[PDB]
Design a protein around this ligand. Structure first.
Ligand SMILES: CC(C)(C)C(=O)CSc1ncc2ccc3ccccc3c2n1
Length: 149
């Protein structure tokens, strides 16, 4: 049922239904969760098992996700530093969460935007398109190449 896609051995991508499989998350040694929605609950919050961060974003043609990139990168590095996995999820098409993942692959693994997309698309086959998010990833790639971010 639940597919917590490992983009990297410690970085996982999923949707709303994936984020509710508590046993798999604990078996995968996940200790950090990034919820990239305004309206979904922080699943399992009252159990005190994970560190949470909500990026309150919608899946629209006007939503600004670039503003949250640097905040999400620090949370991922914090999980990376202590040997724990991080799950980033949103909803069915994983448009929002896949944008943050690709951006991290561009920033921390030095993948190009295109190669990062093919990397994620190969492991997570169902990704809904968002031209607004594609444009932001393109602007982010140029800023990386110009050493501006
Ligand atoms: C941004 C987000 C991850 C939410 C998506 O929009 C995925 S959907 C899609 N569909 C057709 C494409 C064709 C070329 C391409 C080059 C670079 C990056 C993405 C694409 C591409 N992306």
């Amino acid at each position: 049922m639940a597919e917590l896609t490992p983009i990297l051995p410690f970085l996982f991508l999923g949707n709303e239904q994936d984020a509710q499989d508590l046993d798999t998350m604990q078996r995968l040694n996940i200790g950090y969760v990034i919820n990239v929605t305004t309206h979904l609950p922080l699943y399992h919050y009252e159990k005190g098992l994970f560190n949470y961060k909500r990026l309150p974003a919608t899946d629209s043609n006007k939503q600004n996700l670039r503003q949250y990139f640097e905040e999400a990168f620090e949370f991922i590095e914090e999980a990376h530093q202590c040997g724990k996995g991080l799950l980033i999820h949103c909803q069915a098409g994983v448009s929002r969460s896949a944008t943050i993942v690709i951006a991290y692959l561009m920033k921390h693994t030095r993948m190009t935007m295109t190669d990062a997309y093919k990397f994620v698309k190969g492991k997570r086959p169902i990704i809904s398109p968002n031209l607004n998010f594609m444009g932001q990833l393109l602007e982010f790639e140029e800023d990386l190449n110009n050493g501006v971010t």
